[PDB]
Design a protein around this ligand. Structure first.
Ligand code: NA
Length: 119
């Protein structure tokens, strides 16, 4: 059973909700290229079960998404508290100003898609 959290820049999984200190403790990593980030934020938001079946195929195990759980996962707490630092380590953000500007753009693009979804 793989427990998965998504950030804007990736999907990250660990078997059996194990504790996570660092990226070395993360067993499954799918990184997203920046041009698809908002599209994938919107698909997570509107068809999470489809996202889950896709990961089940790609990673080879049943999948629990954190967005479909009432209790946060160890992996989710780690990524939320280290969202900038892990994204810098992965090459998405060179500094905090960039992180801020990128997160803003992605969120704005996601909103645009959500507004459109409402006719
Ligand atoms: Na560890």
């Amino acid at each position: 059973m793989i427990y998965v959290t998504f950030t804007p820049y990736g999907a990250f999984g660990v078997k059996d909700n194990k504790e996570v200190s660092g990226l070395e403790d993360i067993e499954y990593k799918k990184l997203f290229n920046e041009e698809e980030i908002p599209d994938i934020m919107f698909k997570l938001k509107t068809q999470p079960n489809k996202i889950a079946d896709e990961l089940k195929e790609e990673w080879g195990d049943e999948i629990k998404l954190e967005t479909l759980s009432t209790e946060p996962f160890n992996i989710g707490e780690f990524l939320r508290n280290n969202l900038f630092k892990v994204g810098k380590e992965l090459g998405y953000f060179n500094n905090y100003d960039e992180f801020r500007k990128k997160m803003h753009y992605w969120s704005t693009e996601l909103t645009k898609k959500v507004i459109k979804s409402y006719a």
